[PDB]
TrEMBL record:
GO terms of biological process kind: glucan biosynthetic process
Any one GO molecular function term: glucosyltransferase activity
Species of origin: Limosilactobacillus reuteri (Lactobacillus reuteri)
Family, as annotated: Belongs to the glycosyl hydrolase 70 family.
First and last residues of every Cell wall-binding repeat: 923-943
Protein name: dextransucrase
Catalytic reaction list: [(1->6)-alpha-D-glucosyl](n) + sucrose = [(1->6)-alpha-D-glucosyl](n+1) + D-fructose
UniProt-listed Enzyme Commission number(s): 2.4.1.5
Keywords on record: Calcium, Glycosyltransferase, Metal-binding, Repeat, Signal, Transferase
Span covered, complete protein: 745 to 1763 of 1781
Source species taxonomy: Bacteria, Bacillati, Bacillota, Bacilli, Lactobacillales
Function: Production of extracellular glucans, that are thought to play a key role in the development of the dental plaque because of their ability to adhere to smooth surfaces and mediate the aggregation of bacterial cells and food debris.
Amino acid sequence: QYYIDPTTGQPRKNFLLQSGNNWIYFDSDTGVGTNALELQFAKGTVSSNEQYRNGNAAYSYDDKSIENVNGYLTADTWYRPKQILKDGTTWTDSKETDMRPILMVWWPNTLTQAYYLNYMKQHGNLLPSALPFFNADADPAELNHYSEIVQQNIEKRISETGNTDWLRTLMHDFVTNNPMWNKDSENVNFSGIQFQGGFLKYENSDLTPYANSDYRLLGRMPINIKDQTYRGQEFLLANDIDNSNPVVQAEQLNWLYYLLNFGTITANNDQANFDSVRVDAPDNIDADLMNIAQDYFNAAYGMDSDAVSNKHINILEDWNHADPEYFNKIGNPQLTMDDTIKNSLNHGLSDATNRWGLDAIVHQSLADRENNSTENVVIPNYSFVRAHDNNSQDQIQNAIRDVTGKDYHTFTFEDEQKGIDAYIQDQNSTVKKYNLYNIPASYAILLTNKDTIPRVYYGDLYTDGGQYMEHQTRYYDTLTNLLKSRVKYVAGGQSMQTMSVGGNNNILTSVRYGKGAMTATDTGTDETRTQGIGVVVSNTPNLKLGANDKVVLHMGAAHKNQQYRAAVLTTTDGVINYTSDQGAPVAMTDENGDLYLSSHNLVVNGKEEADTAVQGYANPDVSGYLAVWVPVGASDNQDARTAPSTEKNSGNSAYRTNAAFDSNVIFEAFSNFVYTPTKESERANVRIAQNADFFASLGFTSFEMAPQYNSSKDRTFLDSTIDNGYAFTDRYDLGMSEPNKYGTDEDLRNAIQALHKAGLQVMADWVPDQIYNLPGKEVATVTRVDDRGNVWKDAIINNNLYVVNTIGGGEYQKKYGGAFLDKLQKLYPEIFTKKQVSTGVAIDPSQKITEWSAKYFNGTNILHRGSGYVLKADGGQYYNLGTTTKQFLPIQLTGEKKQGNEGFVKGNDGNYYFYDLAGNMVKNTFIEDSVGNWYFFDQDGKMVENKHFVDVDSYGEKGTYFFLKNGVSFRGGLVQTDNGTYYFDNYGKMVRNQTINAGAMIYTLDENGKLIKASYNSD
Ligand SMILES: [Ca+2]
């Protein structure tokens, strides 16, 4: 029963002996000999490979174990396995911190698993560099083989470095490479208003009850409230706030109260409150918010008196041409802009080529100013030449783009400064490429215009770049003079005329009569004789008046035989200004009251009179001609402005367009490209407080401030790169958590208070459209759309699940969110009862928005996460922990394969086959079982049981093996045949041409495998 070794004396353990026709194998434990021909194949034998199924399965189904968003799984998912291959060798029970990538064990298809291996080989070095790339034809079992080795190598590197930080860098880099999980499947398009690459629209679904909303009305601009006309562009930037939702509508009213009472809310201050608001993107939001803002302003401020209304002058950013109508119909709660004068001035004077006829300035506007002598007749409006977002934002950016070649997507301060340098040099040039022509000429018309409030842009007084008021522009001296002249002289009716002498409808005459006179035939009151103004402007630099042609300033019957001094004159190099009466060239009117100018110079008692002749000029200041004439003998303290009436208005409008309305001037007190201060003294709001009286000196009554909200600094759009204040995370944060680009909340309060003491209004930039960069993640059902909201051409993210950044808001959003709705409902109950048009129902204060979510948003900008970023199964079923939808996880995390496969299977005639964890028939591979037996499967996957010396190639293992009739490869022992005794090492490989030391014995072997000499040796 036992073979006992002659040399050692011990019974032979693990020994095979041939005796004629019989083969006897001796036991490895004791040495009991049984017939090797009758060796049984194990009945319920399982592979050591199935130890992975036990370990790689998830620890549990909790937030702690498996990382999840809203319930679902993502491509960048770490999970907690049951066991860890510590150093890629030993299975160990996982701790709470042991987190592994889901893509290490799971793949959506075999193709991406092949792409996984190729990426982890090249960029990861977790596979041999000599190993070839895996194609689409690669064997699924072979792909499973190498991917399992990658796990071993991953765990090896973790045991060496002690980090998992390199993994999150490597796995995220892999995710972004596939067209499944990046911007490739996003349909990235920059059509029109799609600044950030396009938009995704949130939709109601069973899969995401969080994303559900009964409202979400799109394109509800002022013209399209009732949805009667065409719907506008609802989506603009970042996370588009749903303003159809009455819960949000109440929150917007709550936020409006916060801005209008800021000083009281934060520091119990009285004079540190905003008096008016600027509606940011009115044509992009649900225009219900206009009526809500109207309802509050009529109830809290009670705007039915000219004296009360003109102390709170609200304005709109309505670029729509049909908007002045609607806002006039609803009673002008906020002032509509006059885009028509802007077009008439820009295309008439500012254009580089093919200027408009200057008839446009006269006729094309909300007020025809040819013979305007009537009051309270036109739509109350504000007008401007340039703004922060208009006629600058794109040009300045182009200057940076030309000098350095960079977008707002990374340029640094240095490259921003280089662009500004080129922009200001261009500004101070005769031929301009980025700057508008005839700025002083444009402003000379604007500030002398009747039936409109003018708005002076910051970038026209101070440089668009630099620190706040660090540098003054070229046009500073002229505009400041014109603004001071407006206070003294500009009043009464207006008269305008055009000549066709040089070009076609060039050369314009602009005349104001002064307080007391409306028409030309009006003789005027007492004050009229020194009031009024005369402006001559031409747009052609080629202008050469005829020897007989004369330009006439018809000052009217009020100014018969008066003396007029020069205020602004055009020279060959630039312009000359005169602030006082002394030093200025003088001109006289006739019996009719006409100031004659011609091709020849003016003459007083035999004098040349400086530069007084009307002719075409070409210099950095004027590309045409400019002249401003002013009556002499004016008081030092003269004020042409008329006081607002305290009478109750019988009409149904918030603002009347009288002369007292014309007394106001708005200052847009910022450019988008102001530099972020380094010193405390370089802060914008500190300097506004210091120069508070100076802003009154120019005649500014309404002071439009920059949006004081803290920037997101995400560099997704321009508003977050230079930090305007239009790109914010926290709506209620006004330099409170950290100082913004303009200063702290204390600096802001000081600025507002100083302006109130100087006798000015202060405007809050109300931005109810979007919220930038939110910290929390959420899964919502989306649809790829355009700016208006229409489904994209061939949208591949149509009704797909997507991870969006909607959760968040900030500290002060959580503090003041809906915190004033309780007081507002008690104070003014009429606001909360009024049924909103478009919504159908009134605003809803019952829910306070302290934290934002997908419910309160209409949509989002494209996020480049991928259309298949939310993990779904092979046949299209989204993986979930059971929170939102039915619990479903992959076969890897549960850890139980079931089909006609896995482990060892006997298939009728085909002997024994092996199927791996996935269920693929394995060929040319050695498979070790749970106990420690290696079985080989040939080129057909059939188990070998020959008992003959068979050569195997396998996975780079060139060697000769021996297979018993049970299926096990013989290893670590001797086989005695009729040809001699043969030895096989611990791996089943036959030892040849070597003297080896096995146990207590030493075996010498030749090039045939036969034993030469077996000897015992100790010590
Ligand atoms: Ca919107």
